[PDB]
Structure formats: C-alpha cells, structure tokens
Symmetry: C3
Subunit: 214 residues, 3 copies
C-alpha cells in the first residue's frame, strides 16, 4: 500500500561502527562465489571460491568476527551465520568466544566442502571441519564439529566437540561432551554417508550456473 | 555503508543452466496467486490459483524439479521448498528422488488447500496431500504426507509415508514406517482438527487483499 | 535470467484490506529503531525505541493484530512474528486469540529488553515478558512467557504460561501447564543467566551504528 518508497540498498555491506568495531570491514568474496541478490552478507566475512550463497541466507559479522566460509562450501536458503562478541572494551580478546583453526582466530569458521543445508544455523563461537554436512534446520553453537561429519536434519551440537567422522541422528540435541564422545560413526552403509559430496558437487555447479545469470 | 550499489533484481526467475538442466525454466504462476516481493521463486515451479507466498519464503527448483504448489495453498514466511537432484548425467530419471502423484512426476508436490506454516520446510523428494497443515518450524523430507493430516509445530517426517487423516505431535521426529503407522488420528475434538481450513480461508483472502496492493 | 524486471517495493508496508481489516494500518516505528532493508514489517505493528530488526526477519500483522515490540528489544535474523485471527465477521473479539498485558489487547506482545534470537518465532496469541531471551530456533505459540526467562535454543512453549524467572532446556517442547510449572529457575550460576543483558546491550548499540549507515 502506498509503497512507502522503493527500498534501495546493497545486500553486501560493511558492518557498522560500534564500541567493539572502530573500523568497519566489508566482505572479501572470491569472484567465483555466487551471492544471491536476496541473501545478506555483512561485515568482516571471508567467502571462498565456488561457494553458493542461496536466497534468504544471512551472514552477519558485526558482533563476533571474523566469519569465514571455505572453498566449495554452500550456505543454503535461510541459513544464518552470526556470533557472540569477540572483543571487549578495555582491550580485545574475549577468548571464550573465539575459535582457533590452523593458527588463525575466527568467530565462526566454516571449512572447505561444507554444506550448511536449508534453514540450519551456525552461531559463533563455532568451527565446522571440512567435508561435513550440517543438515536442514540443524544447529551448531559454541561447538567444534570435526571433518567428515553429518548433522542429520534437526540435530544440534551446543557447547561440545564432535569428533571427526561421526554423525548426529535427526532431532538429537547434543549438549554434553560425554554424549558427543559416544556418537555413531559414519560408515560406507550409513544413509548420509555420500550426501555431502553430492551436495557440494551440485552447489559448486549451481554457483557457476547462477554466476552466468548475473 | 557506502551502499555498494542498489542491488537490482527480480525475485521470480529462471533456474540456471547446469549439467542436469540444459534448458532453463521460469515459474508458471496463476494470475490470482500473490508472491510477496521479498519471497523468492526460482526455476521449474508451478504455483496454483489463490496461493499466498509470504515474505522470506524461498521456492527453488534448480536441482530436483519440478516443484508444484496446488490451488488455495499457502507458503508462509521463511518456508523453504527445494529438492534433491532428479536427473542424472547419462540420461535423466533418478527415480528414488522423484515422487509420483496422479500419474505425474515431481521433485516436490504440495497439494491443494495445504498450509506450509511459518519457517517450515518440505524438501524433495516429497509429497503433501490436500488439506494438510504443515506446522510452524516442521520438516518433511523423503516422505509422503497424506491428505487431511496435521504436522504440529516442530514435528518432522523423514523417509516415511504418513497415512491420511493422522497427526504428528509437536516436537516428534518420525523416521520409521513403524512409527508413522502408529500415529494418532485427527478427530473432531483434536486441538488442530479445524486449524487447516481456517488458515486456508484466511490465506486465500490475504492473497486477494495483497494482490489489490500491487 | 532475463531479470523479469527489477522488483521495486517498500519493506515497511500497510496490511491489506480483508474481511477482518476494513481499514489498513501502517507500522508505527520509533525513529531510533533500525529496520534492516532486507527485513519485512507489515501492518498494525508497534516497534519501540532502540530496537534492532535484522535481515530476513518478518513481522506481519495482517491477521491477528496488533503486534508490539517493546523498547530495546531485538528481532534477529529470520525471526517471524505473526498471529491467529483476532477478529470475527459478525463483530470483532476472538478473545481466545487475544493476549492482555497492562490493560491493552495484542495479538503478539513482545516486552522491553527482549531478545528474539536468530530464526526463533513467536506466533500469537502470545506474550513475552521483559528481559527474556528467546533462543535460537526456539518457538512460542499460544503462550505467555514471563519476565526474566530464558528459552534455550530449540526449546518451545505451546499453550502454556512460563512463570517468571524460569528457563526451558535446549530442545525441550513444553506443551502442558504441569510441565511449565516445574521448569528450573534462572540462578546466578546458570549458563544463560547473563545472556539476555549482554545481547540487549549489544543490539541497542548495533541499532545505533546501523542507523548511522542509512
Ligand atoms: Zn547472534
Ligand atoms: Zn536442498
Ligand atoms: Zn501465522
């Protein structure tokens, strides 16, 4: 009604100046990544090559920072990436909210060949190791998910470390290290054992096809 | 900041050319459906009459296709529809990812008078029968939900067939046919027994009112 | 592809004329609130001072109304606010879908200093009392959540009243008053005991910083 205006704006933007961010940062996005026009990418974000960011995803590095998404990974529709404050006001380092991967600090670290499937969320401090599938509507927060893992749909990892090569059964919310330690292993015969590689192959190809439409 | 540009684009678009999609398709949307400007609808999609598609929904038919949404159905805010690859690269048919309804093949089939309530998701291969309510934040994947069903909020159906007229209690994740077979029946006295008809009546009327604003 | 057009529109709009809404309403938003350009705010909505509304949130007051969001509260990315019909067609009051707070009627009432964290949802009829954190992916519907509460991530409150100062453990879906009555108390040592105040401080400051970018 009356169409207030026409709402003009860029969906890829710098974060705002705040008490913890004196110097604004703009996303560093590989020329081969595809960012949908209806996705949002704000602030100190690194996006790797051949990544596909789908409609309605929101990657916002304005509190905890930086947020990194490795090569050939995909951030599906409605996926949110955001993180707890990583810097104080007396100095910086709020170490409990900072994750460390290959000698570098991140608020959120999403490795290479990782699928963040539709409506999932990874909230920092968090790390997700290469070749892992984070299923539809799943949730990772204050956790480190190893490589070659599978979070089935609606699973969650909160305050834990998921060892390499394990999976979390659909609907299960893992909140203790004891339970993370006991998760089942991905084997050749497991139902999601080949899911991530298929999804990554598909999404690298969708990123290229969509790049050819812009 | 600096407003990179002004991000110009159409929210109703064709899917990209890929190895499994040599010929791009654009959505076929009944003139009486309403697509919110902040919803996204991509690729080989059929949208029926009087359907309301709300803000932030994402209907994306660029992998598995086609995605159909029957007459007088509604796709609420933040709802995602997407599907696994339905075609190979040696020919087409990836039959396990294709659902069959009234002699036609679909990646996702949403019947008539179906409510996909806010932030729910239906991921193909999947079918949802007429007059069913898919509740807020619910999830359907690799499943066939019968007609006159009710997925309460946060329920899920994965790899199963939900018989006609049953409901899934809030929060319950159904992953086996044994459990789907035992779901409770919708009766006149059940709390969500009249919910879908009310929602459909409302949403057909919202679609018309919103059409009068464009 | 072919970019149908350029999709021009306002993300802050009036609700449509319907059988239950003869007179359209436009949002009343305090000059100090920040509404992201990729959020949607429709209809009879009141937004308080210093509120931050993030990308992909959808606040839609076109069925049940009004929807109020108190001062210094935040509506994070992908959060949906919507509500069941509050008025009939023979008169108005559908009292079971109307919540009452300080002598005023609302379809959804979000108090002051409340955090609706990413991808959560509050569906009316519902009220959320001051200083409460509604966690990531959580859900509140047909419920009254007291003040100083914490809904951990993926918790839910449906058809219940959550007493003041209690929390709901991650993943738990509370559907009966008996269970709401037995929830645990927020104590100084509880893991989310200081979470809301931190989040509100942060989000008031982000709202101001983002306002300085528009
Ligand atoms: Zn956050
Ligand atoms: Zn998908
Ligand atoms: Zn609703």
């Amino acid at each position: 009604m009356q169409e207030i205006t026409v709402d003009e704006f860029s969906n890829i933007r710098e974060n705002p100046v705040t008490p913890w961010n004196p110097e604004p940062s703009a996303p560093v996005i590989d020329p081969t990544a595809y960012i949908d026009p209806q996705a949002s990418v704000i602030g100190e974000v690194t996006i790797g090559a051949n990544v596909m960011v789908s409609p309605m995803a929101s990657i916002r590095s304005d509190e905890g920072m930086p947020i990194f998404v490795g090569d050939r990974s995909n951030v599906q529709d409605g996926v949110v990436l955001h993180a707890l404050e990583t810097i104080n006001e007396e100095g910086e380092p709020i170490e409990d909210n900072i994750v460390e991967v290959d000698g570098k600090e991140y608020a959120v670290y999403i490795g290479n060949n990782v699928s963040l499937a539709h409506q999932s969320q990874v909230h920092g401090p968090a790390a997700v190791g290469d070749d892992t599938f984070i299923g539809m509507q799943a949730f990772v927060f204050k956790s480190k998910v190893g490589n070659n893992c599978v979070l089935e749909p609606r699973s969650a990892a909160i305050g834990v470390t998921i060892p390499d090569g394990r999976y979390i059964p659909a609907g299960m919310v893992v909140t203790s290290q004891a339970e993370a330690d006991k998760l089942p292993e991905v084997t050749d015969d497991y139902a999601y054992s080949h899911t991530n590689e298929a999804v990554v192959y598909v999404n690298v190809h969708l990123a290229e096809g969509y790049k050819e439409t812009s």
